[PDB]
């Protein structure tokens, strides 16, 4: 499913308002990508499906710090 591994950004719903305010149901998908992250701890690459904003969190924190939080919830990578 279109879910970021890191943040948990799922696809939310909403309206697609026209100039005459015709509310047609749509949905906002998150900016997901299957990226490979080098983990310096175990000397390897780890493939994670993450949102573009997730990558910024992985750059803010440590990939190890994020993989610590990922394992706490009970997920795979």
């Amino acid at each position: 499913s279109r879910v970021c591994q890191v943040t948990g950004k799922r696809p939310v719903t909403g309206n697609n308002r026209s100039h005459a305010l015709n509310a047609t149901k749509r949905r906002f998908l998150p900016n997901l990508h299957s990226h490979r992250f080098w983990v310096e701890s175990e000397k390897r690459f780890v493939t994670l499906r993450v949102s573009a904003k997730g990558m910024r969190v992985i750059d803010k924190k440590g990939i190890d710090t994020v993989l610590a939080e990922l394992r706490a919830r009970g997920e795979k990578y």
């Binding site: 992250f37 080098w38 310096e40 690459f45 990558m55 750059d59």
Partner: protein, 149 residues
């Protein structure tokens, strides 16, 4: 990004400088190869005392060891006596594997990824100058010779 640099970067960097770089260059190139590290408070402290004084020079003498690795084979020539066609036009193109194996079997113990080829895959029979990437600055000059059997 800040990014503290461990290795000597080609253009912008020069060992332990906190020069601004684009995140892609950090996470795709500088980090995974082990060339630089992100600089966020505690890393700067690891680089300040421990790495810069000791491990920078240990990383430097490894470049001298890499320069020594070129000096393992003093001959700097390899005579490939592979099978050939009717006067020139070789049977198969000499890839990096054959050169790497031929050099490793009796010369420098270098991996295949460092072995570059300036003049393509070498199909013409004759003398060919080949250069390896033992170090970023210092390049080798091995005189490969493809002979028709």
């Amino acid at each position: 990004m800040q990014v503290i640099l461990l290795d000597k970067v080609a253009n912008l960097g020069s060992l332990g400088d906190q020069v601004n770089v684009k995140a892609g260059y950090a996470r795709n190139f500088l980090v995974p190869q082990g060339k630089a590290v992100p600089a966020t408070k505690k890393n700067i402290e690891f680089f300040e005392a421990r790495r810069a004084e000791l491990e920078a020079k240990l990383a430097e003498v490894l470049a001298a060891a890499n320069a020594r690795a070129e000096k393992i084979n003093a001959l700097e020539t390899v005579t490939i006596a592979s099978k050939a066609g009717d006067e020139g036009k070789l049977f198969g193109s000499i890839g990096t594997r054959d050169i790497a194996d031929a050099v490793t079997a009796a010369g420098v113990e270098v991996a295949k990824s460092e072995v570059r080829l300036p003049n393509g895959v070498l199909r013409t029979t004759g003398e060919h100058e080949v250069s390896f990437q033992v170090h970023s600055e210092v390049f080798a000059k091995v005189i490969v010779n493809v002979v028709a059997e």
